Every structure is written in structure tokens, then in C-alpha cells.
Amino acid sequence: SEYRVDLVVLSEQKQNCRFGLTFHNLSDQDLNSWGLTFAFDRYILPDSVSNGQLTQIGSFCTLKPEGIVLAANHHYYCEFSIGSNPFRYYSDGFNEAMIDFVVDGQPQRAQVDVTPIVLASPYRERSDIPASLTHAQPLLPKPNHIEVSDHSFTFDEQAGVAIYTDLANSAKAWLLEELQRIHQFTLSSSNSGKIIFKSNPTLDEGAYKLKVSEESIKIEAGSSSGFTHACATLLQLLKRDEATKTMEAVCCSIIDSPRFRYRGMMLDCARHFHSVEQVKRLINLLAHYKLNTFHWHLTDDEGWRVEIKSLPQLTEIGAWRGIDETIEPQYTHLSQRYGGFYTQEEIRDVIAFAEQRGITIIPEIDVPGHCRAAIKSLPHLLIEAEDTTEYRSIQHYNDNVINPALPGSYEFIDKVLEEIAALFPAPYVHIGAAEVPNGVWSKSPACQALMEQLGYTDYKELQGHFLRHAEDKLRKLGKRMLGWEEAQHGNKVSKDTVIYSWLSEEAALNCARQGFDVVLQPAQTTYLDMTQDYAPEEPGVDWANPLPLEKAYNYEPLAEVPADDPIRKRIWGIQTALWCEIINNPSRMDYMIFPRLTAMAEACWTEKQHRDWTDYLSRLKGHLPLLDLQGVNYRKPWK
Known part of the structure; x- marks a missing residue:
């Protein structure tokens, strides 16, 4: 409580929000050589910062003030802007804040109180x-x-x-x-x-x-x-x-x-680490609603959670982030060393536990993008000193994409895939294959050389090069490859690659008609990280949109497709996903997962003719005491 930062919305116009940041030194003594650090999920426009120098690495923002000194009982004010429609939720504000300063000749650090953001345009309506x-x-x-x-x-x-x-x-x-x-x-x-x-x-x-x-x-x-x-x-x-x-x-x-063969839930463990016990607890809960697949998102920019014995740096460096770690902190726990991983002994224990409930586990290793944690753990394999290419990922990283011209990139992927394939008995491995940022590799000497060797004109074609390698490696390892939405475009992967379609139902069915088997996981209605109501106090994100229980239940997959349509054979089934950028504890996780999971289960299991919103709600009300006995901190539908 010595230090406080207030964020206020000053103006909201078409695709632009301006903010007023006010930092208060409420201590009795001055701050010298001081700097502010905070966690923010939006791209701050660099040309918009008005009184200081702002650096942004993912969610991690550091603001360097103009002046060396801020007096006791004084305030520092700075404006910035972003490309955004209006903020509706308090969670859109800064998650955490801190300062660094020098007392005498030694560096110090203090937590900063983050006032809830003063919103201009919260929703009036309520579900x-x-x-x-x-x-x-x-x-x-x-x-x-x-x-x-x-x-x-x-x-x-x-x-x-x-x-x-x-x-x-x-x-x-x-x-x-x-x-x-x-x-x-x-x-x-x-x-x-x-x-x-x-x-x-x-x-x-x-x-x-x-x-x-x-x-x-x-x-x-x-x-x-x-x-x-x-x-x-x-x-x-x-x-x-x-x-x-x-x-x-x-x-x-x-x-x-x-109704569908594949009935899945995906848990993001990279963004925030959840314990083995929490994963087990969730897996068992999934079986209660007759889901048969747990998709383990083990890897991303913000963490690497799976032990690779041949490359221990991936867990030793890449499972941890912090000020004193190699990887900068992200989202929460700015002050300490945040992280964790699953050992292969633990992973086997979770596999057998999952097997006892009819749950198959599918592991995901992300390449070529979403690889910052890997890159920071293996700079000797994965970095090219000479590459000067300027790019920015959708998550505000400039240094997180694997280089397909380095032989170490192939060493790394081959070793990881060998150990994952041996460790996970399911005949499938998910490879990410998200579209890379535009312009990437374009100023890399090694890639420029590989482009001329390969005869390619556009650097985007190097994704397919790396991914076709990964698919063939997995094939020799006895596994079919899985990828996200964007893998289907260009020539990047074979028609054997199973495509996880998040874009839309028509885009998914379009993918099916090209010969890919597809899984349906549309962002509009299957993303449990989305807020459950329009009230600003509700935790979550809303980039796709708010997902109240009713909108979740209205999701009727393949409603317009006829029963005798042969395209239904391309549809493996349905998945629901929990991304964990702002979910770092069991209580919050339960709140976001339940009760909407039960609506997702009914979408995968029950045929549309026996589906009814009134009927469903009566069944959900009767089900709630069972969730109460289990101590599941679900969001109460009747308040």
C-alpha cells in the first residue's frame, strides 16, 4: 500500500482507446532512478506513450519515466493508447504492478497496488x-x-x-x-x-x-x-x-x-502451470460428462511444461519465468519466480489415471510459432545471431518463432517428438502449426539461403517445409499429426493431418471438403476463458465475445447439415478449450469451466432432437448438489 497506480479510460472512438496512468508515491521518502512495471494484455501503441519510454514483451510492460526523481507524496502521470473497442471488464485493466528503485547504492523492489480500472462503457444489460x-x-x-x-x-x-x-x-x-x-x-x-x-x-x-x-x-x-x-x-x-x-x-x-466420436476438452498449462492433482481432478470431472479426450496444451511462449530428458534446459529454463529468470514474467506473479512442469514419471501417472476413465490424452508441441520458451532454453540450437528480421506476433513477441534454416531447430523437434511419442500412447500428436507473424525470416541469412536452395519466392512457404518434416518424423514414430485451423492453408501438411477448426463452422466444413478430417472448436462458442456475463465484475476475456451459458447451450453443431451427408465422416467431433492467460488457480478454473462444460458435453453427446434449453436447465439445477459435494467452485446460475 505504499505505492498505487490508477488506470482510467479517457476516450473511446472507432478502434481506439486512450488511457490515463497515474502513479502515486505514497511513501514518506523520495524515489530515485525509479521504474514502473506492469502486466497488460493489449498492444500499447509506441507512438502513443506521452511521458516516458515503454517496452512491451508479451504482457510484460516496463515504463521508464522521463525524470530520475519522484518526490514523496507526489504523482507521475502518463498517457498511452491502444487499438481496441471499449473495455467492458475490470480484468481488461492491469493485472499487477511493481516498481524498481535505488535506496542508497543498492537496488530495491516494491509491489504496487493496482486500482480497478475506471471503465467508461460497461454493459448495462445482463444475462x-x-x-x-x-x-x-x-x-x-x-x-x-x-x-x-x-x-x-x-x-x-x-x-x-x-x-x-x-x-x-x-x-x-x-x-x-x-x-x-x-x-x-x-x-x-x-x-x-x-x-x-x-x-x-x-x-x-x-x-x-x-x-x-x-x-x-x-x-x-x-x-x-x-x-x-x-x-x-x-x-x-x-x-x-x-x-x-x-x-x-x-x-x-x-x-x-x-453423437460424436471425439469429445474433448483442452487445458492450457503453458500460460499458467496447474498441478498434477488439479489436472487429475479435472480429467475425472471430464469423464462424468462422458468426454473421452484430454488435449494437454503443454507448450507456448510463456512456458514449457513437459520434461524432455535429452534436453533438460526446456524444463530447467523454460518451465520458469521471472525477473531473475531468463524468460520475463507474464500475466501474474511479477514479483517472484513463477512456473512448474510435469516430469515424465508424473505424466505416465496422469496417462494411466486418464485411461481408467476412458480418457485419451493428446499432447501438443507448438512450432514454428509459440516457441519463445523453447528458444530461450536452447539459444545455442535455436537462435541465429545474424538474423535482423523485424516481426511482431499476435501476442506481442518479436523473438519467439523457430528458424527452419538452423539444423538445431530440427535436432530440437526430433528429440522432443521422439520423447513425446514414446511417452504418450495415443496415436496422435498436436503440432500447433498456427500461422507465423507476417514478414518473419525475411532478413535471415540462413533462410534466404534455404529459399534459393528450395526455389521458393515467399518466406511463408518455410512453415510447410518445417511442418512437413515434423509430420514425416511423427509418421516414422507411428503417430498421425494434428494442427490448428491455419495448417490447412498453403501447402503445409498432408490431408492426413487432423485440423482443429476454431474459425467458424462453414470454414470447418470447407476444410472437410478438401479431404482433412476436422475437429470443431469454434472460438465464438467453445472457449471457456470467455466471460460468462456482461457485468464488468465477471472474470474472463471477451475478444471472441462474452459466452453466457445460454449462448453456450445454443451451440448446435452441424444443425444445417443433412443426416445422410457424407461430409459427416470428416467430422471427428467437438472440443471445448480453456486458455489460461488469466487463470492461475483451481478456484478460478472451476468458475470458468463450470457449468458451461456440461453444455459442451451435451453438444458432443446428445442429438439435437433431445436438446432443450428449459429441460437442460432443470437437469443442471438437479445436478448442482452433486457439484457442491465435490467442492467444485462453479458459477452459480441462479443468483
């Missing part, structure tokens, strides 16, 4: 959730066919679990595990049990049958995944009485199968 009845069967996702009867089945801890297929072993263990964890309710193996797992080979992958009778529960499935799905439904269907030590399930016949 409204209607009052809702509690549905008796609070099932998310809603099964594609369920029929109910008046009678119900009551059973105690000695009902016994009978299993007549080795296919149901995994799912059975998980059911018993969760019943213990959540409800403290212990079930045991019994050849003569009332709860029965039975094989039915006529049922397709993921499909199951759940019949509850007055004195038994019978589960039927053709696959291990089907049995898990049935167990997820069962966990939601059960009601426990506290006065007794019993469980109840309404009599019903459930016949159910997944």
Missing part, C-alpha cells in the same frame, strides 16, 4: 437465467433415450457388484471409486450381486444400456467406453439418503450412444 424446476433425473449429458417408471430401487453397501465381462473391469473400478470418494459409500464384488455388468456385442463403440428394476440394476455394453459412460450416468442418477446409509435409483430403461 438472465429463468427460474427452474429441479428435474428428478439430473443427467448431463442428457441420454438420447430414457424411459421412466414409478417404482424405484433401493440398495445398501451389500448389494454386490457382478461383472461378466473383462471389458467392464475398468468402468466397474471407477464407479466404486467415485461412490467412495463422493458419497463415502462402499460397494463390493459379488458373483451374486444386484448391480450387474453384462456384455452385449451388438452395441457400438460408446453405446450402453442401463436398466433399473425394483431389485436390480443391469448395465450392458459392447466396449469398455460404453461401460464407463453407463457408470457416469449411474453416478448422476443415484440419490443418497443421509439418515439411512442407502442409495436409490428410479426404475428406467436407458439406451444411449455418443
Whole structure:
């Protein structure tokens, strides 16, 4: 509280915002050779800074004042501008701030209090959730066919679990595990049990049958995944009485199968590191809503989270950022050394944990862009001293793109991919393949040489060169390559590369028609980092737009496509993603993920005909006490 910085919006016009920064020395003694540092997500226009010199590396901004001295009880004021529509949220302000100064002959540092930004144009409107009845069967996702009867089945801890297929072993263990964890309710193996797992080979992958009778529960499935799905439904269907030590399930016949094969969630671990325990906790939660894929975003500009034993610098340098680290801090934790990584022993532990819930893990290694952390960890391999090329990434980096003319770039990727491929049993690896900043490599001697050797005229074609290498390496390693939206354009990758389409549904279907299998993860409606309401106090970002629960539920993928259309074979399925630029703890993560995850699950699992916003809300209301028992800090829809 000695130091405070106030940010105020001064003017908002077409694609321009001007700000007033006022720094207050509230200490009793002067500041000499002082400098201000803060975290800001927007590109500050350098020609707009009015009283100082501002440097910006990603989110990390340092403002050097004009004068060497600011007196005690005095204020320093500086203006800047950005290219932006009006700020709507307080999170659009500075996340954190600090100062550096010299007391006598020694350098010092102090945290600065960041006042919430004074917004000019917050939203007046608010998303409204209607009052809702509690549905008796609070099932998310809603099964594609369920029929109910008046009678119900009551059973105690000695009902016994009978299993007549080795296919149901995994799912059975998980059911018993969760019943213990959540409800403290212990079930045991019994050849003569009332709860029965039975094989039915006529049922397709993921499909199951759940019949509850007055004195038994019978589960039927053709696959291990089907049995898990049935167990997820069962966990939601059960009601426990506290006065007794019993469980109840309404009599019903459930016949159910997944609408899409791929049903995914992606967690950004590069921007902020989340613990193994947090990842495990989330993975288990994903299985409750019958998702089958966890996409682990392990690498980006702001962190490298996966141990590569042959290149230990990637974790030793690249898993940490800070003032005293090589990599500058980003977003939060400006004052300390921030970071973390997953060891390969831990990663194997998470893989096996995921496997027990039917979750496949897909790893992502980002090239050629989004590679700042790698580059700073391996300057000897990855930097070209001679290259003077001036570029800027969409995330305000000028030094974060891999060089396809350096042999060390190929050494690095080959070693990383070898160790990732060996470590991750899923036959897939995601490579990023985001479009590089325009102009990149254009003044690189090594690239200019490679361009003449290759016979290319445009430096953008070097992305394909590097990416075709990565695809072939992965092929020899037994893996199919996955990439983001922009990989499809130019000739960069084969038609074997699975494209994760974020742009739009029509662009995705356009990609399918070119021969690529595609995953649907549109930014307009699947990005859980988006704010959940128009209130300025809501945490999140809104660059795509706000994503209130209703907009999330309205997402009906392939609604206009006919059922007999052959393009449906190109559609692997759907993913929802949590980017973590401003999400650095479990509590916030839960708040942003839930409840919208349940709407995303229903989009991947349930057919549009059984989808209904009113019905969904009743089922969600009935589901909330189960999330309460688990201590999930979801955003309360009824306030």
C-alpha cells in the first residue's frame, strides 16, 4: 500500500482507446532512478506513450519515466493508447504492478497496488437465467433415450457388484471409486450381486444400456467406453439418503450412444502451470460428462511444461519465468519466480489415471510459432545471431518463432517428438502449426539461403517445409499429426493431418471438403476463458465475445447439415478449450469451466432432437448438489 497506480479510460472512438496512468508515491521518502512495471494484455501503441519510454514483451510492460526523481507524496502521470473497442471488464485493466528503485547504492523492489480500472462503457444489460424446476433425473449429458417408471430401487453397501465381462473391469473400478470418494459409500464384488455388468456385442463403440428394476440394476455394453459412460450416468442418477446409509435409483430403461466420436476438452498449462492433482481432478470431472479426450496444451511462449530428458534446459529454463529468470514474467506473479512442469514419471501417472476413465490424452508441441520458451532454453540450437528480421506476433513477441534454416531447430523437434511419442500412447500428436507473424525470416541469412536452395519466392512457404518434416518424423514414430485451423492453408501438411477448426463452422466444413478430417472448436462458442456475463465484475476475456451459458447451450453443431451427408465422416467431433492467460488457480478454473462444460458435453453427446434449453436447465439445477459435494467452485446460475 505504499505505492498505487490508477488506470482510467479517457476516450473511446472507432478502434481506439486512450488511457490515463497515474502513479502515486505514497511513501514518506523520495524515489530515485525509479521504474514502473506492469502486466497488460493489449498492444500499447509506441507512438502513443506521452511521458516516458515503454517496452512491451508479451504482457510484460516496463515504463521508464522521463525524470530520475519522484518526490514523496507526489504523482507521475502518463498517457498511452491502444487499438481496441471499449473495455467492458475490470480484468481488461492491469493485472499487477511493481516498481524498481535505488535506496542508497543498492537496488530495491516494491509491489504496487493496482486500482480497478475506471471503465467508461460497461454493459448495462445482463444475462438472465429463468427460474427452474429441479428435474428428478439430473443427467448431463442428457441420454438420447430414457424411459421412466414409478417404482424405484433401493440398495445398501451389500448389494454386490457382478461383472461378466473383462471389458467392464475398468468402468466397474471407477464407479466404486467415485461412490467412495463422493458419497463415502462402499460397494463390493459379488458373483451374486444386484448391480450387474453384462456384455452385449451388438452395441457400438460408446453405446450402453442401463436398466433399473425394483431389485436390480443391469448395465450392458459392447466396449469398455460404453461401460464407463453407463457408470457416469449411474453416478448422476443415484440419490443418497443421509439418515439411512442407502442409495436409490428410479426404475428406467436407458439406451444411449455418443453423437460424436471425439469429445474433448483442452487445458492450457503453458500460460499458467496447474498441478498434477488439479489436472487429475479435472480429467475425472471430464469423464462424468462422458468426454473421452484430454488435449494437454503443454507448450507456448510463456512456458514449457513437459520434461524432455535429452534436453533438460526446456524444463530447467523454460518451465520458469521471472525477473531473475531468463524468460520475463507474464500475466501474474511479477514479483517472484513463477512456473512448474510435469516430469515424465508424473505424466505416465496422469496417462494411466486418464485411461481408467476412458480418457485419451493428446499432447501438443507448438512450432514454428509459440516457441519463445523453447528458444530461450536452447539459444545455442535455436537462435541465429545474424538474423535482423523485424516481426511482431499476435501476442506481442518479436523473438519467439523457430528458424527452419538452423539444423538445431530440427535436432530440437526430433528429440522432443521422439520423447513425446514414446511417452504418450495415443496415436496422435498436436503440432500447433498456427500461422507465423507476417514478414518473419525475411532478413535471415540462413533462410534466404534455404529459399534459393528450395526455389521458393515467399518466406511463408518455410512453415510447410518445417511442418512437413515434423509430420514425416511423427509418421516414422507411428503417430498421425494434428494442427490448428491455419495448417490447412498453403501447402503445409498432408490431408492426413487432423485440423482443429476454431474459425467458424462453414470454414470447418470447407476444410472437410478438401479431404482433412476436422475437429470443431469454434472460438465464438467453445472457449471457456470467455466471460460468462456482461457485468464488468465477471472474470474472463471477451475478444471472441462474452459466452453466457445460454449462448453456450445454443451451440448446435452441424444443425444445417443433412443426416445422410457424407461430409459427416470428416467430422471427428467437438472440443471445448480453456486458455489460461488469466487463470492461475483451481478456484478460478472451476468458475470458468463450470457449468458451461456440461453444455459442451451435451453438444458432443446428445442429438439435437433431445436438446432443450428449459429441460437442460432443470437437469443442471438437479445436478448442482452433486457439484457442491465435490467442492467444485462453479458459477452459480441462479443468483
